[PDB]
Structures are given as C-alpha cells and as structure tokens.
C-alpha cells in the first residue's frame, strides 16, 4: 500500500493499556497463582502468551472470569511476566531467572524463554 | 530499574490484537457510523482515542455494546482510522484526507490530526 506509519503508535497503545490495568479499567479476568490474584485484560494475555491464546479461543474457557494456574507456578515469576506483557520490560535477576524461565515455558512466551536460556548459558 | 527490553514486543502485541479483530475474537463493542457497523475491542479504542477513552471510563457508557457516532462522521474516514489504531499504518490519500482529519479531530487522535494538517499545508 501507500500508507504512512507512526513509529511510536504501538508503544503508546501498550503504555495506555498498562495505565488501564493499573487503574483496574475494563479488566475481565483474574489469574490465580497459589494464594495470589492478578487482574488483567484477556486480549493482552492472548497477544503475549501461547497458553492464554489457547485458553481464551476455547468456546467454554473464553467466558470464564477466573483462571487458576498450575500450583507449581511461582506468583513472583508470574508477576514479572505480566509486567513484561504490559511494558516490554523484563525484570530478570539472578534470584528470579529460574522461576521466570519456568513460568515463560508454561505460558509459552518464546522470546522470554530464549533470553533466559542465553543468560543462564553465560553464567 | 535493571530491566532488559524486547524492542519488537509492542508491535507484536498490536499485530496479535489486529489478528483477534480480523477473526472477531473477544470484540466487545460495535461502532455504528451512518449505515455501517465496525466491531472492535473497547480497550484498543480507548488506548488510541481521547473520545473513546472518555466514553468507556464513564460508569454508564462503559457497559454499552453499541456506540453511535455523530451522523456527520464519514464511514470511510472511520474505517481508515480504525485500521490505523490496530496497525500504526494510515492510508492517507488526496481523496480522503479531509474526511480523515475531521474524523481524527472528533475521535481526538492528536498525532493523526497533526500529520493531516502538515500534508494539507504542503498542498
């Protein structure tokens, strides 16, 4: 086509979606990880995760307001990944990298799994 | 913070949100423009437009499944802007620039209004 493009548009959209999350505006699901609860937008979860994409395209699960993750999933690992989904920023540290990689493999977030494997290989 | 960042994350999120729109997955509103109907995600509309942000933060309008725009709004101008919201790409042409600018002013999409003013000033 003959379209023009606004370079910062995608980043600005994601920044506004994170503002809506922080104010709990139009969130339509709660993700339960052990005792911890995380509110989010189903569309953002699907856009970032192969696991949520599969869950919310299912004709029965698409209507659930609560999703319980596998009890092996660490709430901190999930929190770091949910923050990444809404910001593009990953808080990867020596003390959390194993829990982050395991959570990203479960959530099917291929690019996060890739950087975790590389950071572990370096050490 | 000490975060790392994935450069293509925001663009990849927006690409997946457009894939959901094209398949009509988790769309939660219909925007009526004269005789024409456009399905979309309220969160994406809010993230892109000052008008939709105001509408869907309203305690009564947040629950509406149908929004009717002002009859002066051109369906083609709206279609081009909805495509821009989900792609960052604007199909700006000599034959549509006046309808696109008028629709962007109504929708409160400041960056689109700015490029339309500049393109009109050049001609």
């Amino acid at each position: 086509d003959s379209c023009i493009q606004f370079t910062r548009h995608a980043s600005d959209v994601l920044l506004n979606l994170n503002r809506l999350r922080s104010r709990d505006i139009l969130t339509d699901v709660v993700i339960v990880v052990s005792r911890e609860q995380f509110r989010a937008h189903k569309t953002v979860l699907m856009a970032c995760s192969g696991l949520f994409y599969s869950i919310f395209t299912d004709q029965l699960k698409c209507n659930l307001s609560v999703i319980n993750l596998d009890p092996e999933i660490n709430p901190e690992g999930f929190c770091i990944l949910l923050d990444f989904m809404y910001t593009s920023r990953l808080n990867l540290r020596e003390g959390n990298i194993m829990a982050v990689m395991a959570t990203a493999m479960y959530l099917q977030m291929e690019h996060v799994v890739d950087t975790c494997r590389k950071f572990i290989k370096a050490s | 913070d000490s975060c790392i960042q994935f450069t293509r994350h925001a663009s990849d999120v927006l690409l997946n949100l457009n894939r959901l729109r094209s398949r009509d997955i988790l769309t939660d509103v219909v925007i009526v423009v004269s005789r024409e109907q456009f399905r979309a995600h309220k969160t994406v509309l809010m993230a892109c437009s000052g008008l939709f942000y105001s509408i869907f933060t309203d305690q009564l309008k947040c629950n509406l499944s149908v929004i009717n725009l002002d009859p002066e709004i051109n369906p083609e101008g709206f279609c081009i802007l909805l495509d821009f919201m989900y792609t960052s790409r604007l199909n700006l042409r000599e034959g549509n620039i006046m309808a696109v600018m008028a629709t962007a002013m109504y929708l409160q999409m400041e960056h689109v209004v700015d490029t339309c003013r500049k393109f009109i000033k050049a001609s």
């Binding site: 379209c3 023009i4 493009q5 606004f6 370079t7 | 604007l90 490029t115």
Partner: peptide
C-alpha cells in the same frame, strides 16, 4: 511519521 515514516514511509514503512
């Protein structure tokens, strides 16, 4: 704005 750019030419993509």
């Amino acid at each position: 704005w750019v030419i993509p």
